[PDB]
């Protein structure tokens, strides 16, 4: 069956994704020796993005 | 519309779930402070590490740092030639049970042996000898546990996550044809 | 009896032909036989601030001391040293030591200001970090030497004096000695490991320092000592804190075994990093395995009284007394390091606070058992040590549950005298 | 002048960023030495996370189209194999583009003439000017400085005599033969020793680096050998080994012989298709093939066993091969057979030596895949380059065992051509050099690749210029096909029969170059090397007569 | 359709004859129903492709025989035939689906 949608938490995450995706562009442009922290946050954001893109597209 | 399989997990979506469980590392870059920071959403601590002092990170970061050799994956409690011998001799003397598996049974035996094969105690014919031996004892009792299936109930007390995602589309397509005979005759 | 050159946690050749020369908490140095020459590797445990290299020997070095600033090599017969700084800006230098007839070099040291070469007749030559000599001093023969940030620890020995340490601190110009030749409690020795005792007769495996500034020494009794209150002249005690004959016996399921050994590298806040070598030969081999850990336990267990209670499971009535000692000892090494020099990292206050919380809590597993067997005097004296005051009224509610009513008065007699103390 | 670690950080300050095409490297498709030198230049840029290109370049005109078209994100450039001899500012037409130039070029070369307008005048072209190839020669230096400065008749004629004598010194340099000083794949390992990444795999790309120039090249291999016999002893797991576990790659030095492909063919089929057996027994005739069976009589090997493949020989014969090769090998002169070589076993697979690996890469580079019929061939070589780049690794062994069975059918088609020359005797024995021109025969399609003529030409040089003193003269080869009659000619060099004082050994760059600017009769210089060209069929006869004139040898 | 093309009427579904007149107008309106959805999420513009889970952030991409130096978004690529790369997986998934770069 079709389960009831989590209407309250999934307003937070779409307001949490667009916040940090500016902060990656703000650090990586605003920096210009440590290329390692900038490739962990780039990996995680494209890993939280895959859960939503395979949850909405499953309903 | 996924339309490939759409009812099970494909086994590239099983290495995505097991990579959210923490293990220990022996780091090789300090970055603590003395008297720029990793600010990710889901873990957001352990900026403060010391060279050769154990800490606990999530597993998908500790495969990023092994590729550059700035970490070293420690063994868990089960990758031990002294510990896996009790979990084999349990299996012979109890032909009805499943002995015990830490639920990342097969998956953590793959991502560690391909990537981190310098940190155990002799994986050659000591750990790949047992883990293939413990998968062929276990795959007998699954095969004898399907002559006894019914149309109301089943018990599968302790099975892993990869020994189930190869067995869903066999059982739930047959047990949906034993339900539609017993209730169609009533 | 013979003198052999000593280096921290070295290992001999054996039947093979490549060994380590030193091994400590920064890196490990290995050597490899080329029949004519040697190829020395300097590999590091840290990766970020340092690089590894390798170079070719033409003299036959067998003494080294690897630390953060430099890498002081040595030669045991010709008296030839070489100092290779990790920085590319400062250049090397080489000096040849005067030697008399029938003399060796035992061990060297590489403090950030001084450079110490101690020979096997007692001479104590001290350079500066470029090669200008400062002193020549005659002491007892030296068989080990090590250093941290500014302090220097050493072990004298003679054929008639006996073992004696000495703990000094060559600062900028301050040369405040602390202990000059006081005696030291350790047992020297008197098979597959006969190749080891020809290499190091003294039996000291690897002496080092802590990360907080406390000397340690890992004897051949397999019992890591430690020195406390060394800033005071008349309060130094040698607290043993680990038995490697006991932690192995627990982990082998209550059994004697001759396969697991212990090789130490360094010490942390409360953990010891160890190379658990498995085999007959008690030195590690190449490649160097991952350093495991091991916790410290004060030696209060009994080898016999655990076996009558049947991995090894301990009853709580015996495990309670050990945590009483262990948080008692660890506080005295932490409460003075802040008061005299201070804290390095900043988080030293909260671990101090949570260590007191393990101190009073572990006493109350014992305090309740003292009321269980109808004893008022034994349970009375235990309530004079709780410096935490919020556990004092917590003990009163355990006094009523055991129904020893006179004991309930005595604890409230303790609270009032410590209450009037605060007002003055 | 420029060492490595100060130049290594000069490439990381301007390449670690967000955009992808920050640096671009160029590889010549022919030098196997230039193949291993970039395979371990990707591993160095994979552990430090820099994004790049790897573009193969065949010709000399194809460098101009690829460079003069795609110039947006050149924050660095890199160039391996090329760029040694020909002046790059005068060929790419580069002008001042703003200290703090926008573009750096780091050439890597293995050739003799330093081409002083690249090393000196280093505005943008970063040199490679450590004293390895440089050798710190000063007479070249001051003459270049006492030239670029542009009673007055007395000093100016004295200046004109000083102009006259100094260009005489500049005609003592720039008048020399092009051969190899150092290998490239030993030079990059000297950069990897200083940074601190030397694995066991990054050693296996020097043993394949400096064995490619042992067989068919000058031998500096005798001077590069004691440096690699110590880096193997240094990285060794233990003295006594476990008994053959399915892990644990162990490379270790072993007494290895000079035959071609012992481990993957029979004994008898290796004694035919060799060089230092063919050079001493003259196997192309019939009078020498009787002497070959005369060896196996003495050695105690039947002629059924000696053609079984080397896996299925008996246990008590491969045990005793190091012993029989020294009692009976003296009488036929073959005593320079036993050398010391390297063997890399990956567990249960089996042993492959060093020389038996570089044959399987020189034979995977041309097989096993008007003017616009030409460039449709050059895309069959550039696309063939990635067919060895993958096979170099340790994961794909089904790609390697295609290579060995493509290698034995290379040196079976050469041996049946090189016999058909030495019966008809198509050699002109002229007063300056020797000449051969091949016009007709079987399988003449194979000989369009420059790595195939140098295989056959290396079989002729060690054949006739042998231990027997006749003379010492260069060869000139010329093969032919259809399709506008290309006539791929190639100048070769003489050798000594291994028993090393004259290292110059080449002249076909200078004296050839004067003729192509004299009539320019239908010639194209389209190679990394200056000693191989094409020429039309009507231009062969008047060109060769001019070679005998103005002889510089 | 709608994957690094953003208006793909032609160039895909190369038959355009096996469909009826009614099934060829149903499809063309349905692709405009998709682009309503990708404008109100902003998880990613065109959330369509890549249902493979992400791993191994830096990949090796070998060009298979398609010149053009076509790409402008996130920098030019200067694309030449048979020359492999080391770029991250975010910029190639828009081209690895076109049959244009062969290796993963």
């Amino acid at each position: 069956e079709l389960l009831p949608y989590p209407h309250q938490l999934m307003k937070r995450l779409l307001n949490r994704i667009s916040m940090q995706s500016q902060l990656i562009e703000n650090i990586s442009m605003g920096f210009l020796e440590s290329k390692l922290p900038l490739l962990c946050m780039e990996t995680e954001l494209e890993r939280l993005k895959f859960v939503i893109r395979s949850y909405i597209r499953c309903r | 519309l996924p339309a490939h399989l759409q009812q099970t997990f494909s086994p590239e979506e099983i290495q995505f779930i097991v990579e959210n469980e923490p293990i220990k590392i022996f780091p090789r870059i300090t970055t603590r402070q003395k008297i720029w920071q990793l600010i990710t959403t889901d873990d957001k601590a352990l900026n403060n590490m010391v060279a050769m002092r154990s800490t606990e990170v999530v597993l998908w970061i500790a495969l990023l740092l092994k590729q550059q050799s700035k970490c070293s994956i420690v063994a868990p409690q089960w990758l031990t030639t002294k510990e896996l011998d009790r979990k084999i001799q349990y299996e012979k003397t109890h032909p009805d049970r499943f002995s015990e598996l830490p639920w990342n049974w097969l998956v953590l035996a793959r991502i560690l042996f391909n990537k981190a094969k310098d940190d155990f105690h002799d994986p050659i014919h000591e750990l790949r000898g047992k883990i293939q031996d413990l998968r062929e004892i276990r795959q007998i009792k699954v095969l004898k546990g399907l002559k006894y299936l019914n149309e109301s109930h089943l018990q599968l007390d302790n099975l892993s996550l990869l020994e189930i995602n190869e067995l869903r589309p066999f059982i739930t397509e047959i047990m949906d044809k034993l339900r539609e005979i017993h209730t169609a005759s009533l | 009896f013979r003198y052999m050159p000593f280096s921290p946690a070295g290992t001999p050749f054996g039947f093979t032909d490549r060994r380590y020369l030193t091994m400590n908490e920064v890196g490990y140095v290995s050597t490899v036989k080329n029949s004519e020459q040697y190829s020395i590797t300097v590999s590091f445990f840290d990766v970020g601030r340092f690089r590894e290299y390798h170079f070719e020997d033409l003299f036959g070095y067998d003494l080294c001391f690897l630390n953060e600033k430099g890498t002081l090599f040595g030669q045991s017969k010709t008296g030839q040293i070489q100092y290779r700084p990790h920085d590319s800006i400062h250049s090397n230098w080489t000096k040849i030591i005067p030697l008399q007839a029938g003399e060796r070099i035992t061990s060297v040291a590489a403090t950030p200001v001084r450079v110490i070469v101690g020979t096997s007749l007692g001479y104590f030559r001290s350079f500066n970090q470029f090669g200008v000599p400062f002193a020549v001093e005659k002491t007892s023969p030296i068989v080990a030497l090590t250093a941290q940030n500014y302090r220097v620890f050493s072990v004298h020995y003679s054929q008639f004096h006996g073992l004696s340490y000495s703990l000094s601190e060559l600062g900028t110009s301050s040369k405040r000695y602390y202990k000059r030749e006081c005696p030291l409690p350790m047992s020297l020795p008197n098979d597959a490991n006969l190749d080891y005792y020809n290499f190091n007769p003294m039996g000291i495996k690897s002496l080092f320092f802590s990360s907080y500034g406390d000397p340690c020494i890992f004897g051949s009794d397999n019992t890591l000592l430690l020195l406390s209150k060394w800033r005071s002249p008349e309060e130094s005690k040698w607290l043993p804190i680990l038995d490697s004959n006991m932690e192995i016996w627990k982990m082998s399921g209550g059994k004697e075994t001759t396969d697991i050994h212990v090789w130490p590298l360094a010490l942390a806040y409360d953990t010891l990093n160890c190379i658990l070598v498995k085999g007959k030969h008690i030195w590690p081999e190449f490649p160097l395995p991952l350093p495991s850990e091991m916790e410290i336990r004060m030696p209060v267990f009994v080898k016999s009284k655990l076996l009558e209670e049947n991995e090894i499971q301990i009853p709580v009535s015996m495990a309670a007394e050990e945590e009483y000692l262990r948080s008692k000892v660890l506080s005295e090494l932490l409460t003075d390091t802040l008061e005299n020099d201070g804290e390095m990292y900043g988080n030293e206050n909260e671990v101090l606070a949570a260590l007191n919380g393990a101190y009073d809590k572990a006493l109350l597993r014992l305090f309740a058992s003292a009321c269980s067997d109808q004893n008022v005097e034994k349970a009375l004296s235990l309530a004079h040590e709780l410096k935490q005051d919020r556990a004092l009224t917590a003990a009163v509610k355990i006094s009523e549950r055991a129904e020893l009513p006179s004991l309930v008065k005595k604890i409230n007699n303790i609270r009032e005298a410590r209450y009037e103390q605060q007002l003055k | 002048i420029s060492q490595f670690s100060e130049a290594y950080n000069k490439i990381l300050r301007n390449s670690s960023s967000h955009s992808s095409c920050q640096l671009v490297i160029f590889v010549s498709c022919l030098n196997i030495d230039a193949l291993c030198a970039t395979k371990m230049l990707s591993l160095l840029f994979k552990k430090q996370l820099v994004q790049s290109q790897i573009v193969p370049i065949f010709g000399y005109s194809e460098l101009r189209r690829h460079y003069s078209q795609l110039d947006d994100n050149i924050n660095s450039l890199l160039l391996v194999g090329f760029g040694g001899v020909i002046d790059l500012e005068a060929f790419l037409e580069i002008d001042p583009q703003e200290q703090s130039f926008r573009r750096d070029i780091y050439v890597l070369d293995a050739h003799r003439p330093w081409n002083l307008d690249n090393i000196f005048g280093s505005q943008i072209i970063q040199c490679f000017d450590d004293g390895t190839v440089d050798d710190t020669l000063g007479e070249q230096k001051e003459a270049y400085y006492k030239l670029l400065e542009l009673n007055d008749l007395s000093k100016r004629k004295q200046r004109k005599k000083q102009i006259h004598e100094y260009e005489g010194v500049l005609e003592e340099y720039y008048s020399q033969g092009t051969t190899v000083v150092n290998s490239i794949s030993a030079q990059i390992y000297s950069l990897l020793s200083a940074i601190g990444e030397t694995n066991l795999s990054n050693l296996w790309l020097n043993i394949l680096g400096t064995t490619s120039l042992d067989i068919a090249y000058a031998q500096v291999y005798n001077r590069l050998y004691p440096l690699l016999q110590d880096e193997v002893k240094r990285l060794t797991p233990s003295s006594r080994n476990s008994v053959k576990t399915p892990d644990t790659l162990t490379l270790n030095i072993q007494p290895d012989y000079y035959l071609f492909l012992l481990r993957h063919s029979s004994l008898y089929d290796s004694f035919y298709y060799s060089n230092y057996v063919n050079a001493k027994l003259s196997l192309w005739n019939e009078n020498g093939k009787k002497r070959l069976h005369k060896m196996f009589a003495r050695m105690g090997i039947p002629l059924s066993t000696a053609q079984e493949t080397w896996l299925y020989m008996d246990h008590s014969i491969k045990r005793e091969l190091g012993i029989i090769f020294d009692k009976n090998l003296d009488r036929y002169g073959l005593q320079d057979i036993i050398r010391d070589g390297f063997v890399r076993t990956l567990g249960y697979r089996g042993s492959i030596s060093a020389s038996e690996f570089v044959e399987a890469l020189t034979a995977l580079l041309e097989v096993g895949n008007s003017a616009q019929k030409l460039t449709n061939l050059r895309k069959r070589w550039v696309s063939n380059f990635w067919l060895s780049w993958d096979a170099l690794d340790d994961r794909k062994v089904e790609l390697l065992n295609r290579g060995i069975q493509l290698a034995q059918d290379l040196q079976r088609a050469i041996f049946n051509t090189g016999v058909a020359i030495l019966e008809k005797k198509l050699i002109k024995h002229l007063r300056i050099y020797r000449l051969c021109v091949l016009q007709d025969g079987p399988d003449l399609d194979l000989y369009r690749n420059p790595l195939t003529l140098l295989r056959l030409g290396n079989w002729l040089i060690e054949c006739c210029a042998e231990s027997e003193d006749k003379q010492l003269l260069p060869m000139v080869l010329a093969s032919i096909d259809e399709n506008t009659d290309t006539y791929l000619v190639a100048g070769l060099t003489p050798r000594y029969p291994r028993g090393t004082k004259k290292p110059i050994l080449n002249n076909f760059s200078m004296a050839f170059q004067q003729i192509t600017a004299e009539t320019d009769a239908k010639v194209r210089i389209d190679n990394f090397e200056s000693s191989i060209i094409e020429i039309r069929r009507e231009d062969l006869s008047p060109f060769l007569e001019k070679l005998t004139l103005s002889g510089l040898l | 359709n709608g994957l690094d093309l953003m208006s793909s009427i032609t160039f895909s579904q190369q038959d355009t004859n096996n469909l009826s007149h009614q099934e060829q107008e149903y499809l063309k309106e349905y692709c405009d129903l998709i682009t309503d959805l990708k404008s109100g999420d902003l998880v990613d513009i065109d959330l369509s492709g890549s249902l493979v889970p992400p791993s191994d952030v830096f990949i090796d991409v070998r060009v298979l025989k398609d010149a053009g130096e076509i790409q402008t978004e996130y920098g030019v690529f200067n694309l030449i035939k048979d020359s492999q790369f080391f770029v991250r997986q975010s910029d190639v998934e828009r081209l690895i689906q076109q049959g244009y770069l062969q290796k993963i």
Side-chain angles (χ1 to χ4, degrees), chain D residues 272-382:
Chain D
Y272 271 173
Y273 311 131
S274 164
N275 287 318
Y276 269 65
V277 181
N278 210 348
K280 307 220 168 197
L281 297 193
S282 52
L283 268 157
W284 75 87
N285 309 292
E286 194 38 66
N287 318 327
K289 203 172 285 206
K290 282 196 161 193
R291 292 177 70 187
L292 185 59
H293 314 83
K294 202 172 163 183
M295 282 184 62
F296 296 139
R298 304 182 162 273
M299 291 179 67
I301 296 184
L303 297 173
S304 69
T305 287
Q307 285 209 1
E308 262 170 1
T309 177
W310 204 74
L311 288 178
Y312 305 96
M313 271 161 77
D314 315 347
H315 170 54
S316 183
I317 289 186
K318 296 182 288 185
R319 262 179 73 178
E320 265 199 324
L321 207 59
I323 305 179
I324 303 173
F325 269 166
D326 58 48
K327 322 207 160 194
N328 315 328
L329 255 187
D330 280 358
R331 308 195 193 96
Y332 302 91
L334 312 179
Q335 218 178 4
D336 55 336
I337 280 300
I338 308 176
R339 328 188 66 159
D340 288 1
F342 309 90
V343 161
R344 210 274 291 261
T345 81
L346 203 41
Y348 275 152
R349 293 184 173 278
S351 310
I352 283 176
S353 74
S355 44
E356 298 159 350
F357 209 107
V358 73
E359 314 271 6
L361 298 193
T362 47
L364 262 183
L365 263 162
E366 57 259 49
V367 308
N369 51 357
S370 178
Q372 284 226 4
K373 288 188 179 178
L374 293 206
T375 78
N376 290 320
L377 282 171
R378 295 190 171 165
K379 285 203 301 202
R380 209 193 63 82
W381 297 335
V382 165

Side-chain angles (χ1 to χ4, degrees), chain A residues 28-29 32 35 38-39, chain D residues 16-18 49-51:
Chain A
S28 43
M29 197 286 311
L32 314 176
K35 215 189 171 173
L38 286 163
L39 288 168
Chain D
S16 201
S17 171
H18 313 323
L49 308 182
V50 195
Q51 323 195 7

Side-chain angles (χ1 to χ4, degrees), chain C residues 130-166:
Chain C
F130 307 119
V132 164
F134 271 180
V136 158
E137 204 171 338
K138 179 97 163 85
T139 55
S140 277
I142 290 186
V143 78
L145 186 50
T146 183
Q148 209 179 7
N149 260 15
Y150 276 126
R151 41 195 60 93
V152 159
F153 185 84
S154 62
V155 172
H156 312 323
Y157 182 70
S158 94
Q159 74 102 18
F160 53 87
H161 284 283
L163 304 160
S164 299
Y165 66 93
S166 70

Side-chain angles (χ1 to χ4, degrees), chain B residues 68-87:
Chain B
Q68 310 174 2
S69 198
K70 293 188 180 177
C71 271
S72 306
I73 303 296
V74 311
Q77 312 163 1
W78 333 107
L79 299 185
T80 304
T81 176
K82 200 168 265 314
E83 186 41 59
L84 279 180
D85 282 8
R86 280 149 197 160
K87 272 170 41 147

Side-chain angles (χ1 to χ4, degrees), chain D residues 63-115:
Chain D
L63 197 140
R64 205 156 189 173
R65 311 153 165 170
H66 281 349
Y67 172 63
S68 54
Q69 275 202 349
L70 310 185
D71 313 303
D72 45 355
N73 277 335
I74 307 180
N75 208 3
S76 155
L77 205 49
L78 189 61
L79 192 146
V80 175
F82 270 97
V85 192
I86 311 107
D87 280 303
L88 312 169
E89 278 196 1
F91 176 59
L92 311 179
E93 294 173 356
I94 321 180
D95 299 331
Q97 296 171 354
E98 312 171 9
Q99 308 155 1
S100 157
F101 295 99
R102 322 159 40 214
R103 168 168 321 131
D104 296 351
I105 297 168
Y106 309 92
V107 297
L108 281 191
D109 47 14
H111 288 79
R112 292 290 295 237
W114 324 269
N115 196 11

Side-chain angles (χ1 to χ4, degrees), chain D residues 493-525:
Chain D
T493 44
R495 288 174 176 85
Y496 280 103
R498 296 189 198 170
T500 83
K501 328 165 189 187
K502 332 288 179 87
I504 35 182
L505 300 182
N506 197 18
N507 293 294
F508 282 99
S509 76
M510 305 147 46
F512 156 74
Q513 258 172 337
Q514 306 180 15
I515 319 176
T516 43
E518 162 186 6
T519 177
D520 64 281
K522 292 302 184 192
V523 289
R524 308 160 200 178
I525 307 170

